[PDB]
Design a protein around this ligand. Structure first.
Ligand code: HEM
Ligand SMILES: COc1cc(/C=C/C(=O)O)ccc1O
Ligand SMILES: [Ca+2]
Ligand SMILES: [Ca+2]
Ligand code: NA
Length: 307
């Protein structure tokens, strides 16, 4: 029972519309929600697949993935997911899984930010548990080298460098905390110097936003060109050594980037090339070990398993 974009065309043909309206509304008060939602889907899929396991709250039986190093004080937008979930439950009771809801929400967030528009495959079901340890082991970190980034993607089933380069384009919008670049700014890999792959002019700007012994929670735009617009500007930045986190710049500057450099350039040269690759990579990531058929359930409240 493979995933299909028409899964809810009869049971809830208005699901995508409900999701979109919820995001449109939220964007007025929080213009960062779109980026935040896309990241939630990414963090869901990289841990036991896209099964909404990340949406589960703490229980006496299992710890929440929300306390993972990659999610704690970082992941956000959970209340917004509850809102669209409630709205969908009203329109179509016990029909749309949280896993599918989050996938649609990620796609709509990308489109609303100016990105490509497409119908994501559907039919995923919700996990019966959360996987904190697995999240700590599977979620990639900003300090990862290119070989480590590739290993992290391959680990969850994405072997193509195209998947890695295209999906990294998610950093074409959204925010990043000073904490994750302090090493690149003042002491990279215990060298006592800033990361040489970071543009010196941009280095000065970032140091001003993130001074030593400063607020590590302060936010910086992932894309200095178009902070809230989903476009290929992220790759243009890499070509100028303006990737924000180490994992971004590595795609273009790593000694192991022989295969990723041409992809970065290709995406920087054509928005069409990037958008096509992003959709293709997004659908592949959304196809990671999904629960289908009668496996798992259709969670009524994304924060807890049905009882
Ligand atoms: C290649 C490995 C990746 C690493 C190491 C990574 C790392 C990070 C880090 C450190 C942040 C900042 C979190 C914070 O400041 O609290 C972030 C933000 C973000 N990431 Fe990535 N990321 C990766 C891949 C992806 C992918 C595959 C997507 C989705 C297609 C994605 C989408 C986002 C978005 C949209 C934001 C902004 C979230 C917000 O503003 O709330 N990332 N990422
Ligand atoms: C049944 O509830 C809803 C339906 C829609 C439909 C939108 C459309 O058809 O474009 C939007 C929001 C709702 O809460
Ligand atoms: Ca998951
Ligand atoms: Ca952008
Ligand atoms: Na696959």
């Amino acid at each position: 029972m493979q995933l299909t974009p028409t899964f809810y065309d009869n049971s809830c043909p208005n699901v995508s519309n409900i999701v979109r309206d919820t995001i449109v509304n939220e964007l007025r008060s929080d213009p960062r929600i779109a980026a935040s939602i896309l990241r939630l889907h990414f963090h869901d899929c990289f841990v036991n697949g896209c099964d909404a396991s990340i949406l589960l709250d703490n229980t006496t039986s299992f710890r929440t993935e929300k306390d993972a190093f990659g999610n704690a004080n970082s992941a956000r937008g959970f209340p917004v997911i509850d809102r669209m979930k409630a709205a969908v439950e009203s329109a179509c009771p016990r029909t749309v899984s949280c896993a599918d809801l989050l996938t649609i929400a990620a796609q709509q967030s990308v489109t609303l930010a100016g990105g490509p528009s497409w119908r994501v495959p559907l039919g995923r079901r919700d996990s019966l548990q959360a996987f904190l340890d697995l999240a700590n082991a599977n979620l990639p970190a900003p300090f990862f080298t290119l070989p480590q980034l590739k290993d992290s993607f391959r680990n969850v089933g994405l072997n193509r460098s195209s998947d890695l380069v295209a999906l990294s384009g998610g950093h074409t919008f959204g925010k990043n905390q000073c904490r994750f670049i302090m090493d690149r700014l003042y002491n990279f890999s215990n060298t006592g110097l800033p990361d040489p792959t970071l543009n010196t002019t941009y280095l000065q700007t970032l140091r001003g936003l993130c001074p030593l012994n400063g607020n590590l929670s302060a936010l910086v735009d992932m894309d200095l060109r178009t902070p809230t617009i989903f476009d290929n500007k992220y790759y243009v930045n890499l070509e100028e050594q303006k990737g924000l986190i180490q994992s971004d710049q590595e795609l273009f500057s790593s000694p192991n980037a022989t295969d990723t450099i041409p992809l970065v350039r290709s995406f920087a040269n054509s928005t069409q090339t990037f958008f096509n690759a992003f959709v293709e990579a997004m659908d592949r990531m959304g196809n990671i070990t999904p629960l289908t058929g009668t496996q798992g359930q259709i969670r009524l409240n994304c924060r807890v398993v049905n009882s």
